[PDB]
Amino acid sequence: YRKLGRTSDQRKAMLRDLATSLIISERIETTEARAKEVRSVVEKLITLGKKGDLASRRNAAKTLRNVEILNEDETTQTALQKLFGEIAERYTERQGGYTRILKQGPRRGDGAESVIIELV
Amino acid sequence: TKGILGRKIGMTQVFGENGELIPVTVVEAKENVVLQKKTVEVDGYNAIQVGFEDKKAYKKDAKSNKYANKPAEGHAKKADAAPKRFIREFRNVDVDAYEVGQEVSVDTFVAGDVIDVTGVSKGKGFQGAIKRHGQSRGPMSHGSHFHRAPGSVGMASDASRVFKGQKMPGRMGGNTVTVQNLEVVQVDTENKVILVKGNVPGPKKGLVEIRTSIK
Amino acid sequence: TNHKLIEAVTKSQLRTDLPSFRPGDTLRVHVRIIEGTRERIQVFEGVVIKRRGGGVSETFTVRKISSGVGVERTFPLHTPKIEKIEVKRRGKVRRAKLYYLRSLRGKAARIQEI
Amino acid sequence: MIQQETRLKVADNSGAREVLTIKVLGGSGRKTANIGDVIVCTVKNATPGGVVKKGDVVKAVIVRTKSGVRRNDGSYIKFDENACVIIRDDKGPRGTRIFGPVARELREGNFMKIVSLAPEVL
Amino acid sequence: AVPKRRTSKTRKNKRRTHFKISVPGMTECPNCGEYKLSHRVCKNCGSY
RNA sequence: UUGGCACCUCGAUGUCGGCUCAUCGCAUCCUGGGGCUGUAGUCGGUCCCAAGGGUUGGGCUGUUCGCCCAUUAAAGCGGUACGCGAGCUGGGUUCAGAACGUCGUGAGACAGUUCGGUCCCUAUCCGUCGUGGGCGUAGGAAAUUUGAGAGGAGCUGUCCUUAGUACGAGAGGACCGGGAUGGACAUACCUCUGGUGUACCAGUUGUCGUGCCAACGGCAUAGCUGGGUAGCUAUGUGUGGACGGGAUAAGUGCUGAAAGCAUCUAAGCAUGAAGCCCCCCUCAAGAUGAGAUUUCCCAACUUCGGUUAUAAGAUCCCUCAAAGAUGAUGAGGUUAAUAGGUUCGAGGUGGAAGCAUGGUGACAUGUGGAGCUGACGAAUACUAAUCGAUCGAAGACUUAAU
Numbered sequence A: 001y002r003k004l005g006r007t008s009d010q011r012k013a014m015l016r017d018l019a020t021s022l023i024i025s026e027r028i029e030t031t032e033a034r035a036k037e038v039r040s041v042v043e044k045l046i047t048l049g050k051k052g053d054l055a056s057r058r059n060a061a062k063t064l065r066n067v068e069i070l071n072e073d074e075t076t077q078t079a080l081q082k083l084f085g086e087i088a089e090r091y092t093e094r095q096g097g098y099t100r101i102l103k104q105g106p107r108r109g110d111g112a113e114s115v116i117i118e119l120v
Numbered sequence B: 001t002k003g004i005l006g007r008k009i010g011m012t013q014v015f016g017e018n019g020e021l022i023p024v025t026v027v028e029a030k031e032n033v034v035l036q037k038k039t040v041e042v043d044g045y046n047a048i049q050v051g052f053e054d055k056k057a058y059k060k061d062a063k064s065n066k067y068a069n070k071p072a073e074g075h076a077k078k079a080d081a082a083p084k085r086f087i088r089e090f091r092n093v094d095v096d097a098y099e100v101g102q103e104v105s106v107d108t109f110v111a112g113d114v115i116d117v118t119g120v121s122k123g124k125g126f127q128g129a130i131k132r133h134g135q136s137r138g139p140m141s142h143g144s145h146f147h148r149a150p151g152s153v154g155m156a157s158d159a160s161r162v163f164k165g166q167k168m169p170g171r172m173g174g175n176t177v178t179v180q181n182l183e184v185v186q187v188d189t190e191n192k193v194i195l196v197k198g199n200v201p202g203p204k205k206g207l208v209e210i211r212t213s214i215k
Numbered sequence C: 001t002n003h004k005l006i007e008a009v010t011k012s013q014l015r016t017d018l019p020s021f022r023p024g025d026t027l028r029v030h031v032r033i034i035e036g037t038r039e040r041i042q043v044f045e046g047v048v049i050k051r052r053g054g055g056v057s058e059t060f061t062v063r064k065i066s067s068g069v070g071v072e073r074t075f076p077l078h079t080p081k082i083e084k085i086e087v088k089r090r091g092k093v094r095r096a097k098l099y100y101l102r103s104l105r106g107k108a109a110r111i112q113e114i
Numbered sequence D: 001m002i003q004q005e006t007r008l009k010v011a012d013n014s015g016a017r018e019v020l021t022i023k024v025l026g027g028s029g030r031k032t033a034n035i036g037d038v039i040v041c042t043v044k045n046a047t048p049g050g051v052v053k054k055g056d057v058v059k060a061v062i063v064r065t066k067s068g069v070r071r072n073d074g075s076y077i078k079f080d081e082n083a084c085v086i087i088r089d090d091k092g093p094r095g096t097r098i099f100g101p102v103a104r105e106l107r108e109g110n111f112m113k114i115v116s117l118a119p120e121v122l
Numbered sequence E: 001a002v003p004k005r006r007t008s009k010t011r012k013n014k015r016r017t018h019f020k021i022s023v024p025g026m027t028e029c030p031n032c033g034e035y036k037l038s039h040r041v042c043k044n045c046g047s048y
Numbered sequence F: 001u002u003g004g005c006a007c008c009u010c011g012a013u014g015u016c017g018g019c020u021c022a023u024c025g026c027a028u029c030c031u032g033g034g035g036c037u038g039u040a041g042u043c044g045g046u047c048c049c050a051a052g053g054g055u056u057g058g059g060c061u062g063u064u065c066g067c068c069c070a071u072u073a074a075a076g077c078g079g080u081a082c083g084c085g086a087g088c089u090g091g092g093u094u095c096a097g098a099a100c101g102u103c104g105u106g107a108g109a110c111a112g113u114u115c116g117g118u119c120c121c122u123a124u125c126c127g128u129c130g131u132g133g134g135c136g137u138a139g140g141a142a143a144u145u146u147g148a149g150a151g152g153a154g155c156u157g158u159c160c161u162u163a164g165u166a167c168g169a170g171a172g173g174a175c176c177g178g179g180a181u182g183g184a185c186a187u188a189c190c191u192c193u194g195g196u197g198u199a200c201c202a203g204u205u206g207u208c209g210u211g212c213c214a215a216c217g218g219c220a221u222a223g224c225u226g227g228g229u230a231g232c233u234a235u236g237u238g239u240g241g242a243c244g245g246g247a248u249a250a251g252u253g254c255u256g257a258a259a260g261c262a263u264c265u266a267a268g269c270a271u272g273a274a275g276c277c278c279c280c281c282u283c284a285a286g287a288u289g290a291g292a293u294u295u296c297c298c299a300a301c302u303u304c305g306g307u308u309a310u311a312a313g314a315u316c317c318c319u320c321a322a323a324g325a326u327g328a329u330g331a332g333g334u335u336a337a338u339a340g341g342u343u344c345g346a347g348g349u350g351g352a353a354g355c356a357u358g359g360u361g362a363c364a365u366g367u368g369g370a371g372c373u374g375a376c377g378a379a380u381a382c383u384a385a386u387c388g389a390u391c392g393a394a395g396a397c398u399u400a401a402u
């Protein structure tokens, strides 16, 4: 696996935060290396969501941050609830994938290959 | 006398007749085919070329060594064989006991022969003088600033130069090594595997050239 | 599994006449000692300390006290030199390797049955 | 793995209660030893009396070590303490008993009186 | 650990023979015909 | 070595010991071959040939040296700016402080002691260790190659047998060869023994937070503690220096005369060493002499090739690791298992959650070797290697055979 030029605690934190944000937005923009490394984490969380049993819920609560989404009509529900009620159904029949990645050109401030990781 | 191209799978252990633990390496020799029979008047030295494994056949627009190229298909079709992945030759063999197109099988080896396995070492990459050359390194305390670097590279004004062969840092690995006087413990003809006492050079999934000890 | 060719070429060396046990169980391993001019048997008695990866490569360790001097013997599980293993009595532990018995002597090294 | 400046217990009634080593016989540059190997050593704690007294230089044989030994079948024998026994330059002990277990590998080294005068051969 | 002498213009220009930028890996985009980097999304159109 | 001379260096050539790394001579310390002896063999002494390899660990001093304690087959002598400080130390010595003894009325002094006392430098060139690109090898390519050369190894102990034999009043005691095991050292590898394993498992303290109990997350060296997969590793596992040729050294001869004898010599022809050459391991056609074998590709405009673009072949680009600083090498790019995910498994950890039972409680038991599980094995196109682009032959003369 990759280290992302960062320590262990700071990476653990970055990976879980990036996975949460992806789950919120359903497509985000970042650099290749971190997309390649958040792919597995988000894919595994969705797996914890395709079962929905209380054990998997409690276990997926480890990674996701506690965030609130305001849906249409001022309806509110958290990241766990999204994962287990709006994304489990979408991928009940698909047996992998769950994400795609679309390389983009280098950014300006660096030569970093920005990419967009999106939930498929 | 005998030679087979194989690849290394791993190491395990077997127990011997009197209970002894035998350390072993599993080598997989399958579809070894003779592709030529070099001759003294045709090429200047008598030997035979063996192709191992099996590539796929030519395809237009290939982008990898998976498939054979037109040049290799032709070489192998002259021996009515499939394109192969690794090709080596053997000199110790009697060229007249082989035919262009035969299969060399694992059973060429009987239990208790003496063989030499020639492979390539594992790559360690760029390394320094203590790992690459076994050098004693300096003191780690008592106010030292010479921890792992190599020591003097020469003398002084006499030989105002560094002599060739001075053991300095660089790439380690990627060298052909021949371990000598190993032996085979069992030959299995169905899974096509020659088991060799000891350990052999190389990464897992590599290539070993087993032949009969020259000593 | 492990590599399939490794597992195939070494399947014949595995023993099946052996019982099932776990670290913490005290047991009697019997061994063909071919010492002198006889194949005798020495009933070695100890407490299993650990055991390792499967295949012919599984090895287990047993600990005893000889004359107030701790002795530990590692044995390959499928060694043909072991006639039989009797789990002389079971053992309630909470580890998989019992390294922490190298500092205790006497009742401190106590084990509950079952 | 026993090298010089290593303190060993004596497993005998020679007088010596505990000794340390200077060399490992057997070769130029030899550095270590295991069961069945002889070492030069000087006692550091003697019993009041005994045939061997404090500060003497003596030949001695290793009978049990914590590093222990591999046997040809893949069996390993390890111990909880280093130990040694004094010898009389004939592979024979200086004392009359021998305390504690001993490893079977001493049979080969023809330390038979050591193997015969022992609580447990192993 | 200091330059014992000057590096002449000849030596200088010689060392930097291999010091150059490579033309980009660009291919034409199938929806718009403008060039894009290979394996990247066209920035003019937004396709594949 | 102690000196003599003052020839280069005072717009600076760091000086002694130790550490790291060696390299070369042989007037050889061990090992190999011999002549001998006031050599019965083991013993020793002497001289000759021999430099291939090897030629310890400590106590004491800043010490080189030397002495001492244990070993070894031996613990060799020297050169290399008394090798090596832009590789290291800085104990001694040689700045300023201080102090004792001595000399000086005194300031101070002593190569008399003593305690303390700042070791800078980002490597341009040559050199050296690795690793790329270009071009040449009379076409363009893919693979296998011989070996001109070059490098690496090169050490040796003990035991048993012959044999208690030869030889010995005895005491003692092989030569040869033929077996067996070591030491040191070099290599390859992780199956075993261990080490480490900061995205594996588990227990636990303080504190903050997800309202709350229960569950969990952040921080405290990874908070700590017990384990531990892959990888990487030694102290761990195998292997190696085994034969055997050819020419020799001191030496030993054979036939043999000058010199009808002799005599190893002059013709010739023998034997003889860890030494030389080969043998064994590795690199090697930039070996500009550029070598060899097999295969693949083969047209059609010219207005005359100083020709397109294309073959065969690669590369760009992208998924990767048995490879890696980068670039290279190697496994793959949909006609696809290259990597991710999913499913199953190995190995690791050790009895998840929620329930029900029992306890006042701290907890325990069954579910259920359960739950979790980074690299390890297999299957599966679910996701990404979609699209495309660039480079790359048309084969010279001369002569001889055909």
Ligand SMILES: CC[C@H]1OC(=O)[C@H](C)[C@@H](OC(=O)NCCCOCCC#Cc2ccc3c(=O)c(C(=O)O)cn(C)c3c2)[C@H](C)[C@@H](O[C@@H]2O[C@H](C)C[C@H](N(C)C)[C@H]2O)[C@](C)(OC)C[C@@H](C)C(=O)[C@H](C)[C@H]2NC(=O)O[C@@]21C
Binding pocket: F012, F014, F095, F119, F120
């Ligand atoms: C940190 C960067 C600076 O580097 C340095 O300080 C290094 C460390 C220095 O190394 C050395 O000390 N010798 C190596 C250590 C030698 O130990 C033996 C025991 C002693 C002594 C001693 C004797 C007398 C006096 C003295 O009498 C007195 C007073 O006060 O009178 C003051 N003390 C201290 C004395 C002490 C440089 C390199 C030094 O050169 C060297 O000196 C010698 C004169 C000759 C050397 N060679 C020619 C043989 C030479 O190589 C200099 C003089 O530095 C003082 C360098 C000069 C150019 C500088 O000034 C530079 C700018 C430094 N200044 C600074 O700031 O950066 C520096 C680079």
Ligand SMILES: [Mg+2]
Binding pocket: none
């Ligand atoms: Mg000057």
